[PDB]
Amino acid sequence: SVSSFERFEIFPKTSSWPNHDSNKGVTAACPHAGAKSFYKNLIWLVKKGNSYPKLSKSYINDKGKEVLVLWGIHHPSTSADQQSLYQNADTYVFVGSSRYSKKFKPEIA
């Protein structure tokens, strides 16, 4: 039960992604309209060429209201795909919020 529901580009695709860059985050898991696609409110990280440095996107996205943010931790299949999507194996993911802290660990299986 909600009284207001807005949608704004928290992390715009056209900007704010200079280092990993790229937009080819499509997959066959969600192939609507006969084409590889992905979640609209989510972005699959793909390296630009063979570079994938650390990411820091500390944002406020604060409009005087509670803002719901969603994200996924991609666990790959083979180590070849890990270096074909991220160029490094031993990574870590951390979402730093005043109410939520988590040090993620990727898994290859």
Side-chain angles (χ1 to χ4, degrees), residues 9-82:
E9 258 173 38
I10 169 175
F11 295 146
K13 164 191 60 213
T14 82
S15 45
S16 80
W17 299 119
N19 67 282
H20 317 115
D21 218 298
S22 87
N23 50 270
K24 316 151 281 303
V26 291
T27 181
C30 323
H32 149 85
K36 278 189 159 233
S37 81
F38 192 61
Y39 305 109
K40 312 177 290 284
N41 322 307
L42 273 192
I43 288 188
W44 208 5
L45 266 293
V46 165
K47 46 197 177 83
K48 184 179 179 180
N50 281 133
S51 75
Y52 198 105
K54 73 162 191 43
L55 58 97
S56 272
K57 300 291 306 159
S58 306
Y59 262 59
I60 46 89
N61 317 112
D62 156 44
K63 330 190 102 172
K65 267 191 300 220
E66 319 226 312
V67 163
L68 176 64
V69 307
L70 298 117
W71 70 93
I73 317 289
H74 175 249
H75 293 340
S77 162
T78 87
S79 178
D81 318 328
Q82 171 84 350

